[PDB]
């Protein structure tokens, strides 16, 4: 409250954390169905469906630009590249599979990173 705070974690690693992240996320082989946005034109249902569109290569702009004030406001794009993919696609299918690995892969840099 007023006057009273917790002990002050240093944050001014975590840009640069955050960064190395997404450049694990953006390298790795199954990034490809979310380096991009997609293309709205191209992709039936999508803009009707997902009502908010997020990426990679928008997360990077984002971050690059200042436009994330914290770490939760980071994750929580990157998440929802995921439960957009979710939203959209069958488990079964070759871009559901890379979701379901490209978040479990981002969880755990988290937790390694920030975590533990
Ligand atoms: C993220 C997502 O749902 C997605 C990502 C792609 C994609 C990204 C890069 C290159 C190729 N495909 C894609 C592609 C989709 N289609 C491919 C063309 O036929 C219509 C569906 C549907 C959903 N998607």
Same mark, same amino acid.
């Given at each position: 409250?007023? #006057?009273? /705070?917790?002990? /002050?974690?240093?944050?001014?690693?975590?840009?640069?954390?955050? #960064?190395?992240?997404?450049? =694990?996320?953006? *390298?790795?082989?199954?990034?490809?169905?979310?380096?991009?946005?997609?293309?709205?034109?191209?992709?039936?249902?999508?803009?009707?469906?997902?009502?908010?569109?997020?990426?990679? #290569?928008?997360?990077? =702009? /984002?971050?690059? #630009?200042?436009?994330?004030?914290?770490?939760? *406001?980071?994750?929580?794009?990157?998440?929802?590249?995921?439960?957009?993919?979710?939203?959209?696609?069958?488990?079964?299918?070759?871009?559901?599979?890379?979701?379901?690995?490209?978040? /479990?892969?981002? =969880?755990?840099?988290?937790?390694? *990173?920030?975590?533990?």
């Amino acid at each position: 409250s007023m #006057s009273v /705070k917790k002990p /002050k974690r240093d944050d001014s690693k975590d840009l640069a954390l955050c #960064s190395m992240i997404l450049t =694990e996320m953006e *390298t790795h082989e199954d990034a490809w169905p979310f380096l991009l946005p997609v293309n709205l034109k191209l992709v039936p249902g999508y803009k009707k469906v997902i009502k908010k569109p997020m990426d990679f #290569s928008t997360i990077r =702009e /984002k971050l690059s #630009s200042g436009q994330y004030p914290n770490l939760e *406001t980071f994750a929580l794009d990157v998440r929802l590249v995921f439960d957009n993919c979710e939203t959209f696609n069958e488990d079964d299918s070759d871009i559901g599979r890379a979701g379901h690995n490209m978040r /479990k892969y981002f =969880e755990k840099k988290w937790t390694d *990173t920030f975590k533990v």
